[PDB]
Design an enzyme around this catalytic site. Structure first.
Site, PDB file in Angstrom:
ATOM      1  N   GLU A 869     -13.322  -3.581  -0.080  1.00 55.66           N
ATOM      2  CA  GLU A 869     -13.536  -3.157   1.286  1.00 55.66           C
ATOM      3  C   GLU A 869     -14.556  -3.919   2.087  1.00 55.66           C
ATOM      4  OE1 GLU A 869     -12.746   1.405   1.176  1.00 55.66           O
ATOM      5  OE2 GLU A 869     -13.903   0.734  -0.556  1.00 55.66           O
TER       6      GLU A 869
HETATM    7  N1  MCN Z   1     -16.413 -10.107  -8.042  1.00 53.36           N
HETATM    8  C1  MCN Z   1     -15.091  -9.807  -8.002  1.00 53.36           C
HETATM    9  C2  MCN Z   1     -14.794  -8.500  -7.393  1.00 53.36           C
HETATM   10  C3  MCN Z   1     -13.463  -8.176  -7.347  1.00 53.36           C
HETATM   11  N2  MCN Z   1     -12.491  -8.991  -7.821  1.00 53.36           N
HETATM   12  C4  MCN Z   1     -11.075  -8.603  -7.744  1.00 53.36           C
HETATM   13  O1  MCN Z   1     -10.805  -8.162  -6.403  1.00 53.36           O
HETATM   14  C5  MCN Z   1      -9.890  -7.022  -6.423  1.00 53.36           C
HETATM   15  C6  MCN Z   1     -10.489  -5.845  -5.719  1.00 53.36           C
HETATM   16  O2  MCN Z   1     -11.609  -5.249  -6.635  1.00 53.36           O
HETATM   17  P1  MCN Z   1     -12.459  -4.013  -6.162  1.00 53.36           P
HETATM   18  O3  MCN Z   1     -13.259  -4.380  -4.940  1.00 53.36           O
HETATM   19  O4  MCN Z   1     -13.332  -3.514  -7.383  1.00 53.36           O
HETATM   20  O5  MCN Z   1     -11.401  -2.885  -5.666  1.00 53.36           O
HETATM   21  P2  MCN Z   1     -10.302  -2.005  -6.442  1.00 53.36           P
HETATM   22  O6  MCN Z   1      -9.717  -2.710  -7.561  1.00 53.36           O
HETATM   23  O7  MCN Z   1     -10.937  -0.630  -6.598  1.00 53.36           O
HETATM   24  O8  MCN Z   1      -9.158  -2.007  -5.275  1.00 53.36           O
HETATM   25  C7  MCN Z   1      -9.280  -1.067  -4.152  1.00 53.36           C
HETATM   26  C8  MCN Z   1      -9.477  -1.789  -2.827  1.00 53.36           C
HETATM   27  O9  MCN Z   1      -8.469  -2.835  -2.673  1.00 53.36           O
HETATM   28  C9  MCN Z   1      -8.232  -3.208  -1.326  1.00 53.36           C
HETATM   29  N3  MCN Z   1      -7.521  -4.421  -1.321  1.00 53.36           N
HETATM   30  C10 MCN Z   1      -6.208  -4.285  -1.106  1.00 53.36           C
HETATM   31  N4  MCN Z   1      -5.504  -5.450  -1.202  1.00 53.36           N
HETATM   32  C11 MCN Z   1      -4.101  -5.489  -1.042  1.00 53.36           C
HETATM   33  N5  MCN Z   1      -3.358  -6.614  -1.135  1.00 53.36           N
HETATM   34  N6  MCN Z   1      -3.423  -4.249  -0.778  1.00 53.36           N
HETATM   35  C12 MCN Z   1      -4.117  -3.084  -0.667  1.00 53.36           C
HETATM   36  O10 MCN Z   1      -3.451  -2.025  -0.419  1.00 53.36           O
HETATM   37  C13 MCN Z   1      -5.561  -3.056  -0.853  1.00 53.36           C
HETATM   38  N7  MCN Z   1      -6.324  -1.848  -0.752  1.00 53.36           N
HETATM   39  C14 MCN Z   1      -7.754  -2.073  -0.439  1.00 53.36           C
HETATM   40  C15 MCN Z   1      -8.566  -0.835  -0.770  1.00 53.36           C
HETATM   41  S1  MCN Z   1      -8.386   0.315   0.449  1.00 53.36           S
HETATM   42  C16 MCN Z   1      -9.393  -0.737  -1.801  1.00 53.36           C
HETATM   43  S2  MCN Z   1     -10.453   0.541  -2.052  1.00 53.36           S
HETATM   44  C17 MCN Z   1      -9.587  -6.718  -7.880  1.00 53.36           C
HETATM   45  O11 MCN Z   1      -8.374  -7.424  -8.200  1.00 53.36           O
HETATM   46  C18 MCN Z   1     -10.754  -7.354  -8.608  1.00 53.36           C
HETATM   47  O12 MCN Z   1     -10.410  -7.735  -9.936  1.00 53.36           O
HETATM   48  C19 MCN Z   1     -12.790 -10.247  -8.403  1.00 53.36           C
HETATM   49  O13 MCN Z   1     -11.890 -11.001  -8.841  1.00 53.36           O
HETATM   50  N8  MCN Z   1     -14.130 -10.595  -8.460  1.00 53.36           N
END
Ligand code: MCN
Ligand code: FES
Ligand code: FES
Length: 906
Positions: A869
């Site tokens: 986010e």
């Molecule tokens: N230092 C990091 C941090 C994160 N990531 C990667 O980035 C992605 C997002 O990680 P994270 O921020 O921990 O979020 P979540 O996995 O909990 O995903 C939820 C987040 O994901 C978002 N991104 C989205 N992206 C797409 N394409 N579609 C949605 O519906 C999405 N929904 C939103 C919303 S809303 C939310 S809350 C994950 O693949 C993670 O492995 C990474 O490679 N390196």
């Protein structure tokens, strides 16, 4: 009816069709070429793009009667299969251009047609092609898509080879921090990936198809429901109402705050006595097909008594307004925010510089290319199994079980299908209980599919925030106090509404060391669409006002907006707005990296303004937490296999962000001492009957919390394999010793919930971003155009570069739609994808750039933080500041539509 012979992907095919059939239905239902998707169903998204006789067309708006004999048709299945991949598919995978992948087939087909006519198009050429052909993508931010096309073009020209642009395993063996394609890439770029709707074609015979009979008025009492005529309709197996529900017929908010006026039990599964919002489902029709069910649903009659309609927070706040939920005031929640000393002496002092303002964030629609969809059935053990896009399977099971009259986990199982994006709407249960209701009543598999108008009128929306706030600074520019007030229009259903309201106490003004704060928050029930979490969940709505006022204050002090921010940001000594010490102090460092880009835009913007097109530059600071408030926990298991491979079990829900890449990168990195390679890490995910409770893929928590649980489960497997003093056992020796093969992992975040005045340490990790934008304003019309975007970010160590890059591009793109075009206000004007104003390619600048400040997190797995986010925290505040900077017009009420920008133009 007539048979039409048409050549599909090189082979003739005689199809028995009806002249009124839509090419899209024919291709899907009769030829099972499921790669051709139906998004909007009105020719706006281009997700159903096929090549008909050399022309690129949208199969959803083509009648069979308009299709010629022997016409040739090309779908994704005619471009490349998993074994004989096209250069276009290879580029897509190597660029991470497929996230949720729901728009992938349409983009690739459309792209292949472009290359047949132009082997060497410029990036701009490609952008126009997608623009003219209505190729929309809600995930990537488009940039990755163009990057992929440009590479495939060089390959078809024989300038670059496939092996040349592909990821190669380093001598390291390490994939943590690399650009390795995601596990699901291939399935997505080939069109084999099965989405909810696609499954409908592959279900058993006795499968039934549902249709909802929705309310067309926003507020009313239910005097009666007449199902009679719909029952008599053709194909209808049965018609259900609230009378057919066995449980409480309610959806619980589960974690409803103790001081909430209500109890979190107001949402009905099928409304019984009142209609709370346009879209409300009063009955479920079961037919032999979708077309037959939809047609019978319209024939269901309601006997209503119309009540007044409160379509906004102010209206529901009027002294004469009736309680929407009898026995509970429309203002069901109060949030206090008290930090430092009383702020009044600072605002009453004639010597301080005070800046005040009222701002408004709209009811932003998620606009996923794939409308909602799901199915359910009876288990071979008597359990009700439900498949959907839910991104919180364990949480939703608990939220719906009591109202269905079931018990988790003995009677109920939830499974997340492959999701074509949610952006948050799935943090909320949409049709899981409806399908469950139908499944229980009939005992047969049921498939429920929403059209785009239902995705729009019957799924949560971002809740609008009305904010009135002010800063009190000294003549030198130091902010000494801040007073804030906010009202959250949450629609009729309270799930997570109070939590969102607390989010305001945590984020308005975040990023600055403000010693004293006094604010009052508020959750108000209205008759407009209910609120479902939306990427940012409180950040975009809180930081827009504070970031715009920040520029207003800068102008009153006579200081540079960028420099002013640089002056107040966190530094040793400062705490957040909850009184929490920031987990990292890289803000000064971020401003230093941003500075060179800022000053260049300063010169470049002045040096490029026309008499007809003024150009400006805007900056903004956004901050958000990674994880759910407090001691947020996650679980995961790892099991050793006989061939020495490993199977990871988690519930890291995938919106299409790349939960698969994240599980793999984290496991692989943690399994280093055992030398496990990437192809030897199998994944079992998102199924409550198989995978542990990892928690929702919301709050940008997965990578940090779940990552840590995965990390921990691996460390246990490693220790479980330790040979006394000497190295490791083997899958063989392991079996002999009767040693356990599976190892469970768990991790709890070192954070504490906020108290009644919003103080505490709610998140262990944060995400910080510095946004800069160059916008061009057409003085004559008021049409703004973001020409460039630079984003300096601190999200810790990167787990996967293609994922994080693609997340920032995508986030910034929604940031533009949030500032300039999106909204869900007019029930008729905003019921279609294009109507609500989703950004098309040309709306996003091809010129977007990212700079990473990899400060590591003590509490993150391998020093990583979330990212989800972060790219939507304050990019809208930047665009708005840019506009003022260009023409002097200041819009505090989003979105900044042309006529709105015009009104505000001095
Ligand atoms: N230092 C990091 C941090 C994160 N990531 C990667 O980035 C992605 C997002 O990680 P994270 O921020 O921990 O979020 P979540 O996995 O909990 O995903 C939820 C987040 O994901 C978002 N991104 C989205 N992206 C797409 N394409 N579609 C949605 O519906 C999405 N929904 C939103 C919303 S809303 C939310 S809350 C994950 O693949 C993670 O492995 C990474 O490679 N390196
Ligand atoms: S353009 Fe056909 S489904 Fe959207
Ligand atoms: S990858 Fe384009 S809509 Fe998700």
């Amino acid at each position: 009816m007539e048979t039409k012979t048409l050549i599909v992907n090189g082979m003739a095919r005689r199809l028995l069709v009806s002249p009124n059939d839509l090419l899209v239905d024919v291709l899907r239902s009769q030829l099972q070429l499921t790669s051709v998707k139906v998004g909007c169903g009105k020719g706006q998204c281009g997700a159903c793009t096929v090549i008909l006789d050399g022309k690129v067309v949208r199969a959803c708006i083509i009648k069979m009667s308009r299709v010629a004999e022997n016409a040739s048709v090309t779908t994704l299945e005619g471009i490349g299969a998993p074994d004989c991949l096209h250069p276009l598919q290879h580029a897509w995978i190597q660029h991470g251009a497929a996230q949720c992948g729901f728009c992938t087939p349409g983009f690739i087909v459309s792209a292949k047609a472009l290359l047949d006519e132009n082997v060497a198009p410029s990036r701009e050429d490609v952008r126009d092609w997608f623009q003219k052909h209505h190729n929309i993508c809600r995930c990537t931010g488009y940039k990755p898509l163009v990057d992929a096309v440009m590479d495939a073009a060089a390959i078809l020209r024989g300038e670059k080879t496939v092996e040349e642009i592909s990821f190669k395993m380093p001598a390291d063996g390490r994939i943590w921090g690399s650009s390795i394609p995601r596990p699901s890439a291939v399935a997505k770029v080939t069109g084999l990936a099965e989405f909810g709707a696609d499954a409908a074609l592959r279900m058993p015979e006795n499968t039934l198809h549902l249709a909802l009979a929705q309310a067309k008025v926003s507020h009313a009492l239910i005097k009666g429901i007449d199902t009679s005529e719909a029952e008599k309709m053709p194909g209808v197996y049965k018609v259900l109402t609230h009378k057919d529900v066995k449980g409480k017929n309610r959806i619980t908010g589960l974690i409803t705050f103790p001081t909430n006026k209500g109890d979190g039990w107001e949402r009905p599964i099928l409304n019984d006595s009142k209609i709370f919002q346009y879209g409300d489902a009063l009955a479920i029709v079961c037919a032999d097909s979708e077309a037959n069910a939809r047609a019978a649903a319209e024939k269901v009659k309601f006997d209503l008594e119309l009540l007044p309609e409160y379509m906004s927070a102010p209206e529901a706040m009027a002294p004469d307004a009736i309680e929407i939920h009898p026995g509970t005031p429309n203002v069901y929640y109060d949030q206090l925010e008290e930090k430092g000393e009383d702020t009044v002496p600072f605002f009453n002092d004639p010597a301080n510089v005070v800046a005040e303002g009222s701002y408004y964030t709209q009811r932003q629609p998620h606009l996923p290319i794939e409308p909602d969809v799901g199915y359910g059935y009876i288990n071979e053990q008597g359990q009700v199994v439900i498949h959907s896009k839910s991104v919180a399977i364990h949480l939703h099971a608990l939220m719906i079980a009591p109202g269905l009259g079931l018990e988790f986990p003995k009677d109920l199982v939830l499974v997340q299908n492959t999701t074509g994006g949610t952006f948050g709407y799935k943090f909320s249960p949409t049709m899981e209980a409806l399908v469950g209701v139908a499944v229980m009543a009939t005992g047969r598999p049921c498939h429920l599919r929403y059209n785009y108008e239902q995705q729009q009128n019957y799924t949560g929306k971002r809740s609008p925030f009305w904010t009135t706030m002010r800063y009190a600074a000294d003549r030198q520019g130091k902010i000494l106090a801040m007073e804030t007030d906010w009202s959250v229009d949450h629609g009729p259903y309270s799930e997570f509404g109070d939590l969102l309201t607390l989010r305001g106490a945590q984020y308005i003004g975040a990023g600055y060391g403000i010693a004293n704060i006094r604010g009052t928050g508020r959750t108000v029930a209205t008759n407009h669409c209910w609120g479902a979490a939306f990427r940012g969940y409180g950040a975009p709505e809180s930081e827009f006002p504070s970031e715009v006022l920040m520029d207003e204050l800068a102008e009153k002090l006579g200081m540079d907006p960028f420099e002013l921010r640089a002056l107040n940001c966190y530094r040793e000594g400062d705490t957040t707005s909850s009184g929490q010490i920031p987990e990292v102090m890289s803000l000064p460092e971020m401003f230093d990296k941003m500075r060179p880009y800022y000053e260049e835009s300063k010169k470049r913007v002045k040096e490029r303004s026309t008499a007809e097109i003024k150009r400006g530059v805007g900056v903004a600071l956004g901050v958000y937490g990674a994880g759910l408030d407090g001691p947020d926990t996650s679980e995961a298991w790892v099991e050793l296999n006989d061939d020495g491979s490993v199977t990871l079990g988690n519930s890291w829900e995938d919106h299409g962000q790349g939960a698969d890449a994240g599980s793999l990168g984290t496991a692989h990195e943690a399994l280093r001492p055992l030398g496990i390679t990437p192809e030897n890490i199998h994944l079992v995910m998102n199924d409550t009957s198989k995978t542990p409770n990892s928690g929702p893929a919301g709050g940008s928590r997965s990578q940090v919390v779940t990552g840590n649980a995965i990390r921990v489960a691996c460390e246990m497997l490693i220790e479980g394999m330790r040979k006394p003093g000497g190295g490791f056992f083997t899958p063989a020796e392991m079996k002999a010793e009767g040693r356990p093969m599976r190892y469970d992992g768990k991790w709890t975040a070192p954070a504490k919930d906020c108290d009644a005045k919003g103080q505490g340490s709610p998140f262990a990790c944060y995400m910080y971003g510095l946004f800069l934008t160059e916008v061009a304003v057409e003085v004559a019309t008021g049409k703004a155009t973001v020409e460039k975007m630079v984003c300096v970010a601190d999200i810790g160590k990167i787990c996967n570069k293609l994922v994080v890059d693609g997340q920032i591009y995508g986030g910034l793109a929604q940031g533009v739609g949030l500032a300039l075009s999106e909204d869900y206000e007019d029930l008729k004007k905003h019921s279609t994808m294009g109507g609500a104003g989703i950004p098309s390619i040309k709306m996003i600048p091809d010129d977007i750039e990212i700079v990473y400040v990899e400060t590591p997190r003590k509490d993150g797995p391998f020093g990583a933080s979330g990212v989800g986010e972060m790219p939507l925290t304050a990019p809208h505040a930047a665009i708005i500041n840019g506009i003022y900077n260009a023409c002097g017009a200041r819009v505090r009420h989003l979105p900044a539509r042309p006529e709105k920008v015009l009104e505000a133009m001095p």
